[PDB]
């Protein structure tokens, strides 16, 4: 073929290169029958390639007939000693085939330097290995990386001893599989007894030895270990540090750099963490080298330690030092830079921001959006995915906030890709685009989308609706929850649970566990006096699993303290139920002391955020008592959703309202509904205005108590217009002072 002067002169430099070029020219037709152009040039890129190419002509045709690819031929011939290796294959492929070695295995082994001797060694030792329980695949791994005959004999020599010392064949092959793995095996044999007495397990030894530089790592543990232990490092830490590639160097760096790092303020736990990742040695060194400059840029010590404590920690620090100026120019604050760099692969994320940031801005994303998308593990791939998929994202009709939402989580890149791949399919199934964004919009969203597509038909056929499915998979862990529904549906319904019960239990985060927990704990619940309906109520919220267990762990003490089964259910059966149930047991004696009945306690704790409501009563009951509020007033105020906030509102705004003419009874009335806090604040801020316009305090109390803040704002907004139209205060109050008062006001004001 037409070789450029570059392709030519590359070959000429090789020993016997001029002959190789000549051979190719003089034998171009013959070679073209067996190999492509690229195959020829690859083989030609080695010394004495003329011998190898001649061997291709002499062996190639037969090897083609015998099942060897062009790729295998190149692997064998394209190496030092390739001519000999290719001949060896042709002479031995048949016998090797008999022994259960595939074409691929034969080519792999022969692909080693001096592969001809590798193959002969295998034939000589195959029966020995087979007798000892090893497979053909093990032999290939042992022979790999130019292990050759020596690696095979090394394994045979040490195996029976390592066997007696409690090492598996899998451990042995794993260690042997690396470069210098045979030497690693001998090192294991020599050092294992001392390692064991120092306190290291077989597993730690195998793990340390099964990396490149493993033998050196084993030596480092024994020789550096004692000094590290004197420096306060445990054997578990030493093993973990040594357990990664470059483990030996990392241990030495802890020893060498440790003292100077501590004197700068870094703890030993921090030093160990930085060292315990791959590239820990470089990270430790980079900290010592770059910490002064980073501090001179303003980064705190804890910040530096955190960036270094992740995988790629060394790159993170270096990239942060390099990119920080340009990032700051783009008005990134230091905290944002830190957020982006403080994860695994932070360096790549920073570089992604620099590279893609400008384009992202032009697409409408702001700094916060970029920081959110890049500020996760895999942040670099998320930003990249956004730019690459943007035209398709635009076509499908996804908004920019939709993009930020499903890309702004861990796994965001995969979420975007999954939504473009599975989206149209799900829309044809009947799922809306906003529901698709919801499902894709959590970590694991890619799997959640797939789960829906896979299970939708079956679940619908069983009586579940598509909105039910959206509800179940629209949370974190959504795929698992849906899978749990499919798996456990039969059992739950056989036990007497309805499909809406199942949906409710599964329809919250942690739903997979909640479903299983209901199955596991139902019998125990019925025995302790609870009903199936109670179980659904308790498990049917966020943290339902913890709520159920909290019931089982606390029901005895609570019952003995005068709380009924119904009381327990009402307390535990809301969001944060486990905390509310615990708070009751913690404060019931003190609350009783302050004049609150069992029923009072249940009422206060029996709403969402019941624990905080209890806490708020204890913290404020004394002051409220002093001001003239009765125990019953306090219970009414705190005994609704948001009771803690309502209680605080009375505490903070009450006197002012009282100064203005509002009596305590009215204050209690305005506050003793859900959203009572908003009501009081609405009266505080807008009350004087309504009063100026001609509304009495009584009117204001009526509206605030029965219509809430919503109704007040509606009267504030539309009141003047209605008055000009001839409506009296009696009419406006009647219209507004009701649930939905805002809507009734709007209806009356409409024609104006």
Author numbering: 15 to 766
From the paper:
In a search for putative DNA-binding domains, BurrH, a protein that recognizes a 19 bp DNA target, was identified. Here, its apo and DNA-bound crystal structures are reported, revealing a central region containing 19 repeats of a helix–loop–helix modular domain (BurrH domain; BuD), which identifies the DNA target by a single residue-to-nucleotide code, thus facilitating its redesign for gene targeting. We identified BurrH in Burkholderia rhizoxinica, a symbiotic bacterium found in the cytosol of Rhizopus microspores. Each BuD repeat is composed of 33 residues, only eight of which are strictly conserved between the repeats.
We expressed, purified and solved the structure of this protein, which is able to specifically recognize its DNA target. The models were refined to 2.21 and 2.65 Å resolution, respectively. BurrH shrinks 23 Å along the longitudinal axis wrapping the DNA molecule, which displays an almost unperturbed B-form.
